[PDB]
Amino acid sequence: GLTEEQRMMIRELMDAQMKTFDTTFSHFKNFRLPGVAAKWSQVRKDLCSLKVSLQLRGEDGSVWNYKPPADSGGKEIFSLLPHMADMSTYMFKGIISFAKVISYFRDLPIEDQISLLKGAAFELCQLRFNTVFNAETGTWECGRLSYCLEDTAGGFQQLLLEPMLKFHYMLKKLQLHEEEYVLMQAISLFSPDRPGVLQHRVVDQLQEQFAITLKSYIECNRPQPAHRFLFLKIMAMLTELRSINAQHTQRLLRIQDIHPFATPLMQELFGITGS
Ligand SMILES: CO[C@H]1/C=C/O[C@@]2(C)Oc3c(C)c(O)c4c(c3C2=O)C(=O)C=C(NC(=O)/C(C)=C\C=C/[C@H](C)[C@H](O)[C@@H](C)[C@@H](O)[C@@H](C)[C@H](OC(C)=O)[C@@H]1C)C4=O
């Protein structure tokens, strides 16, 4: 059974999620849209994991649909960078508000709150994006905005080679509850091994508490044989998400060095100083 203090942890996390996750993206406004050396080969490969079409459903009932251009060894590959930067900044703001609401997070020193956010901002955004991912149609449904994957060789199987895309399909197949999602966000946020963290011992003790609560939650509410080892499956996904976060950070900094795109908030989260 869940202890009274374990139920207390879930309530505060669910409360922080309810207050800071705009599930309909109704406040995502004024975003940019596409127009009406060996570094580039890596940059061409880094961005070629896009292949995503975009749909705006109008409030009046109209629909705008965008189909991306093909790779032509030119500049067209940067067409969605400004829009993805605005979407990321919107989600990053939501992640920062989520952590600030949590009491266990607000009680840490300011220097460590910054270090934990800089290290987990991407991972918490991926976990929130998974809850709006439609694995049947390969589409992230962000309210009036939709991001649909376009067919690109070997159907969905040659697309699952992309680690970020494989993560979303595998995490969605576990059919997690809202409480399990917010506990994964807490475990990833309170990672003591993030660079720059001073209170390692405290953040580690908090992370173990969040993992124990998630473990106990699964034992009490999922007795089916399909959910055997579900806690261990979840922790394996969080380990893979940390690896994807490291791969993604390097691809981000390589593109920024060739073609600037990062908003001021992203520059702050990835260490760019402006000089
Ligand atoms: C911080 O990352 C952001 C900014 C990157 O800047 C740039 C410059 O560097 C990137 C790196 C390193 C990448 O590998 C990729 C992109 C970009 C950038 O444009 C990209 O444009 C599209 C990719 N692929 C896709 O189209 C896929 C597979 C799915 C399409 C739609 C989904 C709805 C999204 O994937 C979201 C689930 C989310 O992942 C995405 C909004 C993400 O924002 C966040 C907060 O995670 C940004 C990519 C991709 O592979």
Residue to mutate, 84, 133, 142, 149, ligand 1, most ligand atoms under 8 Å from C-beta: 84
Distance 87 CA to ligand 1 centre (A): 9
Q: Which two tokens stand for residue 214?
A: 């998630």
Q: Is the CB of 81 under 6 A from ligand 1?
A: yes
Distance 267 CA to ligand 1 centre (A): 16
Q: Is the CB of 87 under 6 A from ligand 1?
A: yes
Residue to mutate, 48, 50, 98, 245, ligand 1, most ligand atoms under 8 Å from C-beta: 50
Contact 197, 115 (CB under 8 A): yes
Phi/psi at 203 (5° precision): -60, -35
Residue from 10, 193, 197 nearest 113 by CA: 197
CA distance 46 to 37: 15
Report CA-CA distances (Å) from 76 to 34, 39, 71, 159, 234. 10, 17, 7, 21, 38
Structural biology method used: X-ray
Q: What torsion do the CA atoms of 246, 252, 257, 263 make, to the nearest 10 degrees?
A: -130
Nearest C-alpha to atom 21 of ligand 1 is from which residue?
50
Contact 174, 234 (CB under 8 A): yes
Contact 142, 21 (CB under 8 A): no
Q: Which residue has the tokens 């975009």?
A: 54
The string of DSSP letters for 92-106 reads HHHHHHHHHH-HHHH
The DSSP symbol for 54 reads: E
Distance 164 CA to ligand 1 centre (A): 9
Q: Which residues are annotated as a binding site?
A: 88, 126-129, 248
Distance 84 CA to ligand 1 centre (A): 6
Contact 145, 56 (CB under 8 A): yes
CA distance 212 to 236: 15
CA distance 213 to 106: 20
Where would I find the H helices in 22-152? 38-47, 81-101, 103-106, 110-130
Contact 148, 135 (CB under 8 A): no
Where would I find the H helices in the chain? 4-20, 38-47, 81-101, 103-106, 110-130, 163-173, 178-189, 200-221, 230-258, 264-269
Residue from 162, 221, 169, 263 nearest 10 by CA: 221
Q: What is the residue type of 146? A: S
Resolution (angstroms) equals 2.2
Radius of gyration of the chain (CA): 19
Q: What torsion do the CA atoms of 171, 175, 178, 183 make, to the nearest 10 degrees?
A: -50
Q: What is the residue type of 45? A: K
Q: Is the CB of 121 under 6 A from ligand 1?
A: no
Ligand 1: nearest atom to the Cα of 266: 1
Residue from 93, 69, 111 nearest 203 by CA: 111
Domain that holds residue 72: 1-275
Q: Is the CB of 251 under 6 A from ligand 1?
A: yes
Beta strands 139-142; 133-134: pairing state? antiparallel
Q: Is the CB of 28 under 6 A from ligand 1?
A: no
Report CA-CA distances (Å) from 162 to 3, 220, 232, 247, 258. 40, 35, 23, 11, 22
Q: What is the residue type of 136? A: E
Residue from 192, 232, 200, 259 nearest 40 by CA: 259
Residues near 203 by beta carbon (within 8 Å), at least 6 away in sequence:
108, 112, 116, 190, 191, 192, 197
Nearest C-alpha to atom 2 of ligand 1 is from which residue?
88
Number of domains in the chain: 1
Q: What is the residue type of 125? A: C
Q: Is the CB of 88 under 6 A from ligand 1?
A: yes
Helix axes 4-20, 81-101, angle to 10 degrees: 140
Q: Is the CB of 265 under 6 A from ligand 1?
A: no
CA distance 212 to 206: 10
Q: Which residues are annotated as a binding site for hyperforin?
A: 88, 126-129, 248
